Every structure is written in structure tokens, then in C-alpha cells.
Amino acid sequence: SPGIWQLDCTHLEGKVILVAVHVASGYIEAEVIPAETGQETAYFLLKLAGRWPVKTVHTDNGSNFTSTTVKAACWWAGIKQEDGIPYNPQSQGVIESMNKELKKIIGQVRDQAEHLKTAVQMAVFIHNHKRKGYSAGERIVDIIATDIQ
Amino acid sequence: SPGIWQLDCTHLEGKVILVAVHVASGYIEAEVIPAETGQETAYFLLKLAGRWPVKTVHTDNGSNFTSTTVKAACWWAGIKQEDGIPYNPQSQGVIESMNKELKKIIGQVRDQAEHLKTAVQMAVFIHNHKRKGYSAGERIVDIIATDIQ
Ligand SMILES: O=C(O)CC[C@H]1COc2c(ccc(CNCc3ccccc3C(=O)NCc3ccccc3)c2C(=O)O)O1
Ligand SMILES: O=C(O)CC[C@H]1COc2c(ccc(CNCc3ccccc3C(=O)NCc3ccccc3)c2C(=O)O)O1
Ligand SMILES: [Cl-]
Ligand SMILES: [Cl-]
Ligand SMILES: [Cl-]
């Protein structure tokens, strides 16, 4: 559980927002990319795994699951690459609701930045700091620290 | 101490590597940029603060300390912007040694990537996972978790 992440890709302003969600905490990292290629996904995973102890990644779609470049990144970073089939149907709803929430926040900050990438990073900040009462940022650290201990 | 970060800028292949160091743990995040502008530094800090609980940032130089855009990012993200004067002279040596280490690792992986940005993210991964015996990644999580209580 401490090392499980889920990839998620959503669209806004004719651009792609690639998101990684730490499943147990709801903590996210995200980036704006022109399009969702294996190369972009691979680079994103390399960054993620250098920053958090990523054991397992549930890929967002079959193309990224298939991608040799994504597989190569997972090999390099010591990540178990898995599919993203929602065996638990609640997974769908959670990701869908998160995408809605992220887009809402982006709208709330959109006039504070010229570029979408900036608005997305503001949304990441707000999402991770939001108290629901602990924040997702507090939860991920506590979960991982407990695992280390 | 749990929320204290230091900025660091080093050069390689005619490009700029911007690094943030969590002082207490030695954990880093880094990016390659064409040049070190206030705008680039501001965006980097916005990303960092969305991902870790950044209380204080010691800026890497006077230009970034002065930069209204950097000040605006620190305001936005709730970061205390400070100077980077090494009142403790050991600070210099530590940053210098880290830059040497990072460049060494980049050299060790350089042929595994076409682009410097990729090599830098590999270096971030290796640096943060390296056992010195805990890793910097383990230390940062433990330090922050203990602070949260
Ligand atoms: O622009 C975007 O899409 C996002 C940015 C780009 C930045 O460059 C890259 C990138 C994504 C991937 C690579 C690796 N390329 C294959 C390669 C070229 C030359 C030598 C070896 C290899 C190799 O297979 N190594 C094993 C490996 C694969 C994937 C990840 C880590 C390690 C680059 C790069 O070559 O630098 O994302
Ligand atoms: O290319 C690079 O250098 C790195 C990428 C760029 C991507 O875009 C940006 C960036 C860095 C900064 C900004 C904000 N610009 C001022 C601005 C423009 C329009 C409206 C408001 C503001 C404003 O002052 N907001 C308060 C604020 C300032 C800095 C940081 C966060 C919040 C952008 C952007 O406008 O989107 O880094
Ligand atoms: Cl796409
Ligand atoms: Cl510096
Ligand atoms: Cl420069």
C-alpha cells in the first residue's frame, strides 16, 4: 500500500494533464504535456520515482501499459508496472471526482497565471494541502514513515 | 528544520541545473533549465512547495533573492524567502560536494539518455536512494513525519 501509485490522464485547453495519485493518501503530482506519449509518460515516472518510493504503478491506459519506453522507465526506476483495470469499481469514481476537483481548482486560479502549467502546479499545491482533518501531504508522509519503521 | 530548503544552481553542457536541497536530510529535487531566470526559479519553487511542506527557502544568489517573481512565488506558496549567506562555512562545502557528486552520477548515466534532463532525473533518483544506513529519501519522510507527530 505505501508504494502504490495510479496514473491518470485528463484534458484541458487542448492540452494533456498527466497525474500520478498515491492511492492510500490521495496525494498527487502532475504535469502539463502537449500529448500523452510513452516518452512523456516514461520521463514523468522517472521523476516521480526519484522523489517518492514508487513500488507499483497502475498505468492509466493500455498504450502506456504496452509502451516499451514506459516499460524501460519502470525497469530503470525499479517500478512494478501494472494495468489499471478497476476491479474495485469505486476506483473509477474516485479518479473521475479527482479530475473534476482538479479542473475546478484550475478554474479558481486560472487568472493568476498566463500559462496552464502554472495553474496546474497551483492546483497540485491546493489539492495536497487541503484538509479533509489531515491533508494528503500529511497522509503520504505518515504512511511512508510508518512503513519505514 | 523540517521545512528548511536551500536552492543551488550548477552548470553542465552549457545548461543550468537548478537544485533544491532539504537541508536536514540531503534529499533533493532538480530540473534542467536553459538559464536561471526569476521566472524559472519561481515556477520551480511553486512545484516544490506543492510536493513538500516548504516553510523556508534559502535562495541560491542575490538575483533570485531580489526577484519580484520569486518573491511572488514565495508569497503564493507560503514560503519564507531568505538569503543564502553561509554563516556556517560548512554550508559551502556541503553544496559544493553535492554538486560534484551529482555531476559524477550524471557522467555515470550520461550514455543511458540522449537528453541531459533525463540524466539529471536519474541522478536525482540515485542520490535520493543512496544509503549512507538510511537514504536521504527515508530521512526526509522520517523528519517530516516526526514533525507532524
Ligand atoms: O520530451 C518528452 O517526451 C519527455 C522528455 C524526454 C527526455 O528524454 C528522454 C525521455 C524519456 C526517455 C529517454 C530515454 N530514451 C531512450 C534511450 C536513449 C539513449 C540511450 C538509452 C535510452 C534508453 O532506452 N534508456 C533507458 C531508459 C528509458 C526510459 C527511462 C529511463 C531509462 C529520454 C532520453 O533519451 O533522454 O523523456
Ligand atoms: O518558462 C519559465 O520560466 C518557467 C515556466 C513559467 C510558466 O508560467 C509562469 C511561470 C512563473 C510565474 C508565472 C506567473 N506569472 C505572473 C502572472 C501572470 C498573470 C497573472 C498573474 C501573475 C502573477 O504574478 N501570479 C502570481 C504568482 C507569481 C509567481 C508564482 C506564482 C504565482 C507564470 C505564468 O504566468 O503562468 O513559470
Ligand atoms: Cl494525447
Ligand atoms: Cl548556487
Ligand atoms: Cl544562467
UniProtKB/TrEMBL annotation, chains A, B:
Its cofactor is Mg(2+). The chain holds residues 57 to 209 of 288 of the full protein. It is found in: Host cell membrane; Host cytoplasm; Host nucleus; Virion. Residues 1-144 form the Integrase catalytic domain. It catalyses: 3'-end directed exonucleolytic cleavage of viral RNA-DNA hybrid; Endohydrolysis of RNA in RNA/DNA hybrids. Three different cleavage modes: 1. sequence-specific internal cleavage of RNA. Human immunodeficiency virus type 1 and Moloney murine leukemia virus enzymes prefer to cleave the RNA strand one nucleotide away from the RNA-DNA junction. 2. RNA 5'-end directed cleavage 13-19 nucleotides from the RNA end. 3. DNA 3'-end directed cleavage 15-20 nucleotides away from the primer terminus. Keywords: Aspartyl protease, Capsid protein, DNA integration, DNA recombination, DNA-binding, DNA-directed DNA polymerase, Endonuclease, Eukaryotic host gene expression shutoff by virus, Eukaryotic host translation shutoff by virus, Host cell membrane, Host cytoplasm, Host gene expression shutoff by virus, Host membrane, Host nucleus, Host-virus interaction, Hydrolase, Lipid-binding, Lipoprotein, Magnesium, Membrane, Metal-binding, Multifunctional enzyme, Myristate, Nuclease, Nucleotidyltransferase, Phosphoprotein, Protease, Repeat, RNA-binding, RNA-directed DNA polymerase, Transferase, Viral genome integration, Viral nucleoprotein, Viral penetration into host nucleus, Viral release from host cell, Virion, Virion maturation, Virus entry into host cell, Zinc, Zinc-finger. Its main location: host cell. This is Gag-Pol polyprotein. GO terms for biological process: DNA integration; DNA recombination; establishment of integrated proviral latency; proteolysis; symbiont entry into host cell; symbiont-mediated suppression of host gene expression; viral genome integration into host DNA; viral penetration into host nucleus. GO terms for cellular component: host cell; host cell cytoplasm; host cell nucleus; host cell plasma membrane; viral nucleocapsid. GO terms for molecular function: aspartic-type endopeptidase activity; DNA binding; DNA-directed DNA polymerase activity; endonuclease activity; exoribonuclease H activity; lipid binding; RNA stem-loop binding; RNA-directed DNA polymerase activity. It is a lipid-anchor. It comes from the Viruses. It comes from Human immunodeficiency virus type 1 (HIV-1). Signal peptide: none annotated.
